[PDB]
Amino acid sequence: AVKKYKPYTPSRRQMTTADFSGLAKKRPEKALTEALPKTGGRNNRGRITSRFIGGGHKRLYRIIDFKRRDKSGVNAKVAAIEYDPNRSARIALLHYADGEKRYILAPEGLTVGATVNAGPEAEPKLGNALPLRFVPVGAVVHALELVPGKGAQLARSAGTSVQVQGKESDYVIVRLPSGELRRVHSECYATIGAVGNAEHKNIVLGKAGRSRWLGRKPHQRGSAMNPVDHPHGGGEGRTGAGRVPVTPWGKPTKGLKTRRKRKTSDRFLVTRRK
Amino acid sequence: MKRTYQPNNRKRAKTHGFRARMKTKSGRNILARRRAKGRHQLTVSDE
RNA sequence: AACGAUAAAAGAAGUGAGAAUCUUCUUCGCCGUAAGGACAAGGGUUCCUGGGGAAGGGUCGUCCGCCCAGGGAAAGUCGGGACCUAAGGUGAGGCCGAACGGCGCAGCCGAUGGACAGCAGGUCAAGAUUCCUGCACCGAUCAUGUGGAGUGAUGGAGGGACGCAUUACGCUAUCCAAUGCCAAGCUAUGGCUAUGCUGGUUGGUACGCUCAAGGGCGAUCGGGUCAGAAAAUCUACCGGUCACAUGCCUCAGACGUAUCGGGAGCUUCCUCGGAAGCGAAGUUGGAAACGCGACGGUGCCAAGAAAAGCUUCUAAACGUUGAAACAUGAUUGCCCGUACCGCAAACCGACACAGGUGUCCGAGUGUCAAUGCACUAAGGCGCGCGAGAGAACCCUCGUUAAGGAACUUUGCAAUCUCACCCCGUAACUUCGGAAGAAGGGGUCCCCACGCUUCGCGUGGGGCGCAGUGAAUAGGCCCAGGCGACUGUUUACCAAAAUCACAGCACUCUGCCAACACGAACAGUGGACGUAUAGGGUGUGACGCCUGCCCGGUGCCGGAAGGUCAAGUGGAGCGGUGCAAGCUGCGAAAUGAAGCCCCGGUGAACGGCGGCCGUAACUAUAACGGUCCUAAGGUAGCGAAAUUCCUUGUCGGGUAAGUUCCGACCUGCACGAAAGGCGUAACGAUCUGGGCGCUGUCUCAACGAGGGACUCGGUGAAAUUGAAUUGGCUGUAAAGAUGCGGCCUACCCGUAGCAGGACGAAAAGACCCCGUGGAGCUUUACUAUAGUCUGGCAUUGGGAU
RNA sequence: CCCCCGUGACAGGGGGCGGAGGACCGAACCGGUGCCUGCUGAAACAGUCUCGGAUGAGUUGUGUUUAGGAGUGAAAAGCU
RNA sequence: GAAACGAUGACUGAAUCCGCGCGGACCACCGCGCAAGGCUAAAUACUCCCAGUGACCGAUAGCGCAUAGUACCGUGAGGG
Numbered sequence A: 001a002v003k004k005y006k007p008y009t010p011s012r013r014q015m016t017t018a019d020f021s022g023l024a025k026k027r028p029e030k031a032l033t034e035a036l037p038k039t040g041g042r043n044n045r046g047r048i049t050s051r052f053i054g055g056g057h058k059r060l061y062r063i064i065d066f067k068r069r070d071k072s073g074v075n076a077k078v079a080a081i082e083y084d085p086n087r088s089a090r091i092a093l094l095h096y097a098d099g100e101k102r103y104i105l106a107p108e109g110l111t112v113g114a115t116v117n118a119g120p121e122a123e124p125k126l127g128n129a130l131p132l133r134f135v136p137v138g139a140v141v142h143a144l145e146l147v148p149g150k151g152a153q154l155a156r157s158a159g160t161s162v163q164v165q166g167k168e169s170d171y172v173i174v175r176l177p178s179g180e181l182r183r184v185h186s187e188c189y190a191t192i193g194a195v196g197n198a199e200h201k202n203i204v205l206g207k208a209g210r211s212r213w214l215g216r217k218p219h220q221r222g223s224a225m226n227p228v229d230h231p232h233g234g235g236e237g238r239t240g241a242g243r244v245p246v247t248p249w250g251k252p253t254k255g256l257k258t259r260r261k262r263k264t265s266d267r268f269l270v271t272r273r274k
Numbered sequence B: 001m002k003r004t005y006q007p008n009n010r011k012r013a014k015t016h017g018f019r020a021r022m023k024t025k026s027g028r029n030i031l032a033r034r035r036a037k038g039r040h041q042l043t044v045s046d047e
Numbered sequence C: 001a002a003c004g005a006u007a008a009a010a011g012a013a014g015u016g017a018g019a020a021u022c023u024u025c026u027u028c029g030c031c032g033u034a035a036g037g038a039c040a041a042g043g044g045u046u047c048c049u050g051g052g053g054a055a056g057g058g059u060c061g062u063c064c065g066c067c068c069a070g071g072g073a074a075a076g077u078c079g080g081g082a083c084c085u086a087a088g089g090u091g092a093g094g095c096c097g098a099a100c101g102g103c104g105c106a107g108c109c110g111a112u113g114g115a116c117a118g119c120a121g122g123u124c125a126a127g128a129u130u131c132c133u134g135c136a137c138c139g140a141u142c143a144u145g146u147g148g149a150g151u152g153a154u155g156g157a158g159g160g161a162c163g164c165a166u167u168a169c170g171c172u173a174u175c176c177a178a179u180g181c182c183a184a185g186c187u188a189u190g191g192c193u194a195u196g197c198u199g200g201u202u203g204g205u206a207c208g209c210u211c212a213a214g215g216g217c218g219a220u221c222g223g224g225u226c227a228g229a230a231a232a233u234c235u236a237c238c239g240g241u242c243a244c245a246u247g248c249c250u251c252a253g254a255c256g257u258a259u260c261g262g263g264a265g266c267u268u269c270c271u272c273g274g275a276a277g278c279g280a281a282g283u284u285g286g287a288a289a290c291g292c293g294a295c296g297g298u299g300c301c302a303a304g305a306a307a308a309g310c311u312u313c314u315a316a317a318c319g320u321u322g323a324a325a326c327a328u329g330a331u332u333g334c335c336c337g338u339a340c341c342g343c344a345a346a347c348c349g350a351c352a353c354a355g356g357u358g359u360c361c362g363a364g365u366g367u368c369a370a371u372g373c374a375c376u377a378a379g380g381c382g383c384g385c386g387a388g389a390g391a392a393c394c395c396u397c398g399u400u401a402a403g404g405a406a407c408u409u410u411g412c413a414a415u416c417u418c419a420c421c422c423c424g425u426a427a428c429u430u431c432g433g434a435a436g437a438a439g440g441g442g443u444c445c446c447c448a449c450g451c452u453u454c455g456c457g458u459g460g461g462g463c464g465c466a467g468u469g470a471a472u473a474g475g476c477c478c479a480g481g482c483g484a485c486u487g488u489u490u491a492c493c494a495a496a497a498u499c500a501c502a503g504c505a506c507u508c509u510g511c512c513a514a515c516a517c518g519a520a521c522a523g524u525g526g527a528c529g530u531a532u533a534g535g536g537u538g539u540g541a542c543g544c545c546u547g548c549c550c551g552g553u554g555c556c557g558g559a560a561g562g563u564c565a566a567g568u569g570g571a572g573c574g575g576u577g578c579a580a581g582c583u584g585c586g587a588a589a590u591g592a593a594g595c596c597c598c599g600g601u602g603a604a605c606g607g608c609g610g611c612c613g614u615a616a617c618u619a620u621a622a623c624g625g626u627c628c629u630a631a632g633g634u635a636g637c638g639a640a641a642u643u644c645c646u647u648g649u650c651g652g653g654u655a656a657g658u659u660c661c662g663a664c665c666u667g668c669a670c671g672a673a674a675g676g677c678g679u680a681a682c683g684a685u686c687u688g689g690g691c692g693c694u695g696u697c698u699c700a701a702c703g704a705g706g707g708a709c710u711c712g713g714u715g716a717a718a719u720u721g722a723a724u725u726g727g728c729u730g731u732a733a734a735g736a737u738g739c740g741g742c743c744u745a746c747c748c749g750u751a752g753c754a755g756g757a758c759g760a761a762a763a764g765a766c767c768c769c770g771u772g773g774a775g776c777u778u779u780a781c782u783a784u785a786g787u788c789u790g791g792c793a794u795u796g797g798g799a800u
Numbered sequence D: 001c002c003c004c005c006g007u008g009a010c011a012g013g014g015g016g017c018g019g020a021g022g023a024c025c026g027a028a029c030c031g032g033u034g035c036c037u038g039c040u041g042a043a044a045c046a047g048u049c050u051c052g053g054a055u056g057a058g059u060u061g062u063g064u065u066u067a068g069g070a071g072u073g074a075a076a077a078g079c080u
Numbered sequence E: 001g002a003a004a005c006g007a008u009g010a011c012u013g014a015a016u017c018c019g020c021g022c023g024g025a026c027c028a029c030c031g032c033g034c035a036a037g038g039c040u041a042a043a044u045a046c047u048c049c050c051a052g053u054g055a056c057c058g059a060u061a062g063c064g065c066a067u068a069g070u071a072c073c074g075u076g077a078g079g080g
Ligand SMILES: [Mg+2]
Pocket: A219
C-alpha cells in the first residue's frame, strides 16, 4: 500500500513511500521519451515569475496523447504500467493491434494487459475513449477536454473522477473533482474510470531532502523579510501582521475572490466550487 | 582570500571585445566615443 | 622598526677587481597523498647557449625568473577545426512595439559532452604518441586483377542511449618475500668469509590445435492496412515454427615460440664530464586496485540529456558489359595548439607576498585498516641578510614541592582523557535509542601447544619505572531554558533561540487557471502541470489539545431602499440682428460599479479590562477580593527569555547561594496554530551543580626556543606652530613646562617603564541646530502603475 | 528473504542472511566553533592550536542567464 | 480664465461661388482672406580642418600633451 520505515534515523520514521509493486519495470519507449530541462521559475527574461523552483533530479517527458481520436475505431492492448516522474498519476503503455505504440494515462484498477477500445462505438469499460454523450448518466470518468480534439485537461491528478450528471442539450453537465458543475460539449471525449495512484495523496514526505528531490526550493514567510523586501516584514519580535494578510504584491490573501469577473466561461458553470 | 580578477580568455573576449561591442547600439557608441579620445586601446580585442 | 614562517647548517676546493651569499666536493638538516611528478586555466620568451651587473633582488652578489645577443617549439593517428548536438545565443519569412528596439518555428552558433586511425624505444644545451630507428592503423584518388548486377538519401526504423548505492568471479598495473637466477667487488672495529652485504630481474609487435574467469546472443515463414506522409528485403503488432541444460560469439588476461627493444653494469677516449661502443639474468611464492573483462548481479525511488557518425528499408535517379564488396601496389596526409612556469618567485593577490587556484599519478617500513600518524625512497628543498650576546619585557613551548577552582564575569586557558580487544553499563524512551553512558581489566620479548592464514587463543618463562612504551588518539556525569531533528545565516566584530524543514491549517485557482515578467491582443514562466494540481499566507516533528468576543477594520454574501459619474433627455433663462436665424447658459426624470445599509466569517485584523479601604505629618515593607464597550480567560502554564515591587516566601545544594532547582500565586505586563502545555533524541546554543585533572589561583620558580640588546649590510612609519620643553602652590576661559612666587636642577646619551604633553588616529557615529538628506511606515497630502466599472468604436442578421 | 520459537481478541520473539540510511568516528574536500598571535600584519580579514559537516538540502570545474528601486537571497536589508 | 485659432487621440467626417475661413466668447454689421497638392537660391548657424592677426600664454602658464590619450589605474564603461 505504502512502504514505511523503522525509526533507525530521526527522519526515517514518518517517512513513507509509494507502492510500485505493480509497476511493469521498463525504461520508457525511446521514440516517446523527450527531454525536459528545468526552469528555475525564471522565464525568457530571466526573472523568477513562478517563485521557489530549484533542481531535484533529472526528468524526461513521455508524450501522452490525450485526444485518443487519432486512433479511435480500433483497439490496443495494455502492455505495461511504468512510472512517470512528471505526473501525479501512473501511466500505461498502449500496443495498438495495428503496429503503432502510444502512451496513455493509467486509471484505477486497469490490470496489465486488458485490451481496451476507443471510439463512440466503445464499451463503458475502464480505459475506453468515449464521447461524453454516449456515457451513462452518473458514470465515473476522467481526462475531459474543453472541446473536441483539443486535449484532455480535466481529471488528471491522482484518483480523480469527473462525474456525468447527465445530458441536456449538446452540452453535458459534469461533476468536476473540485466540487463544480460544468457544461461540456457532448462531442467532447472521455476515458472511463477514476485516475488511480490514489494512494498518492497520503505519502508522508518525511525530510527536507524529499522536498528537494521533487525540486521545490524552501518556501519563505514574508514575516522573515524586511520592509524593503516584502509587506509583512519588519517588527521587533515574532510579530503579528498589523495589516490584513496580503501577498508580496499586497493583493490580499485569505478570502479574496480573484477570478476575472466578466468571462466566456461564466455561461458553462452552473454552480461554484464551494 | 580568493580575488575579484580570475582571467578567462573566452570570457574577456566574449564580454568586452569587438563583435560584442558592435552587437549593441551603446557599444557602437562606446566605440566611436573612444576613438574620439584617441584610444590606442580601442577594445579588448586590441590587446 | 623591520629584512616576510624557528626546515639548520659546516668545512674544504674554485672563481673574481672584490665572495657568509655564485660554482664544484663531502657531510648535516626539512618535505615525501609533498615541500615529488604530470595536466588544465592563466602568463608570454620567463626555456636552452654565450655573455653582462646600472637598476629589479628586502644584505651580498662574480648570481638570477633582471639586462644584451643568438638559438629552441615540427603530428594524417594526441587536443580543437575541416562532423554532432545541450544550456544558452542566434535566426529570412513570422509575431509585436513612440524610436533605438522586444520576441520568435525551422536552420545556424555554441564543449563542459557524443564521435574518432599508433604503439615501443632513441636522442639537441634547449622539442617529442610530432623528429629519427623498428614494426602498425585510418580515409582518400588511380591501376592490374576477383568483377559480373545492383548502388542505397534532404525521408523510414534500428542503434547510439546514459540514475544512485551495494557486490560476485577472473585479471593487469603495481608492491613485498626468499640459500631462485645474473652481476659487482670487499673482510672493516670483536665477529661474519657467505647460507653475508649492494644491485638488476621484460617493454612492444607477430604467430601459436596452449590456458582462460567474465561478457554479450536468438531464428525463420505468414497475416493485418490501419503504424513509421507513401514506399518498403527493413522497423512495429498478431500468429506459427524452432535439442530446455546450451551451444552460437567474444577473449580482459596469462603460458609458449619468435623478433624488435630495454636492462645492472663493463669497457674505451677525454676538454669546470661527458662523447661512444658493448650487455648478464629474466625464477618460485604472496598481496592487489577507484583500472580492464563489461553495457556483469542485486537491491533502491528521487526514476536517471540530445544529435551526427553508425546499422537496416525503400523513393527518385542514372546503371543493369563495369554494381557493389575485396586483395594487393601505387599515391595522398589541410588548419591552428605543442618551449617554459603551472599548488607557484613565472597564474589571481600593487610585492621574488605564511592567502586563493580545478583533474590525474603519488613508493616503502611499522601500524586492525587507511590518501591516517612517525621515519624514509625517487624527487625536491634548507623558504636571498648575516654574526654574536645570553638583562627587563614579549611571543611559542617543557617541568613542577604542599594545595587543587581558593581563579574568575564562567575552569576562559591549559592538563585530564586518548587507539584496538575482553567484562560490564542508569534514569528515560517515539523501542531506533540514549551508548564509546558509567566502571573495569588486558596490550611488550621468548619458548612449547593448538587453531583457518601475515595471523590468533592457551600455558610457562623474561625484562624495565612503566610494554596503543615514540607519534596520530573522546574527560565524564546530574539537572534546567530554547529549538524537535540533518541542514541555513550577518564575505570582514553576532552561527544562535535566526531561517529552512517534514507536518498541520485558512483562503485563492476549472485552463488563454489564478499568480508573475513585460513598449505590447507579442512572447514567456506557472506547466508541456489540471484541483490527490498550482499560488499566496501563517504555524513549525510528535503527543493530548487549541476556549470566550463578529461591536470597529478586513473579507464572503444579501437586497428593499438612501445614492452616485459622464451620457440621455432641456421645460425654462438670457446675448444678438428687423429678421428666417446663429448662440451663451442650463433645470426635471433616467442613469455603472462602489460606498451607506442587512446578515455571515478567527489556523482573518484584532480583542479577552476598569476598581474598592486601613488608626497617621501632604508616606514606603501588607492587605481578602465584588468586575461599564462585542465579550471580559476554557484547558495547560505561571516570580518564567515574560516579574515592576525584588536578594518575594518556603524548601534543596553550600561552611556561607541576588545565581540555580521544586513548590507557592498577589500573572505591574502567560494562554492556546502571531499556537498552549509536554517530550525521547539531536546542540562548536544557553544555565547551575558535581567527579576527575590541572600553575586558573595561593605565588610563583628553573629551563628552552623565537624577539628585545651588540656588531657589519639595506633602512621605512604615523607625527610634527616653532621650542633653549622641571617641581610645588597660585593666577589665568575654570586641569599652566611658557604668567606669579617659591623650590629644584652641570652637558650629552643608552636600555626600560607608560603619569603628563586634555598624547596620535577619524573635523563625535551620542545630544541640540539645518524650514539638510536618504530608508521605512500607515485610516497624514497629492498623484499614479494596476484594477473594477457606464458610454463609444471594432460590432452583424433575426425571433418575441 | 530464510528457518525454528508464539497462539489470551493481538503487531510478535530468536538465529541466519542481507546492505538501508539528510546514520556514526574520521582524511581529502566543504565550513569557521572558542582562545591566543597578528592590528605602520607575512595577509585590507589571516596563522597555530581547538571545533562543525564529511552519500547529502553534499563539494567543485566549465559553458551560460538574471542588475540597479533592479536582480538575487534556507532572510542578515545580506549580496550584486 | 469670458477661451478665440491652430494642433492632433477617440467618436462624428458640412458647404464648393447668391459659396468657404478669420477678425480672442458669442450676434449683426463691416474689413482682411482662397484650407483639403509639391519644389524653391539668397541672407542665418556651426567650425574637425586652412590661413591671418593679438594691451592671449611661455614649461605649476598654455589643450591633457613643447605632444601622449601614451606610461599608469580600472573586468569594464571609463579615468589619465
Ligand atoms: Mg511551508
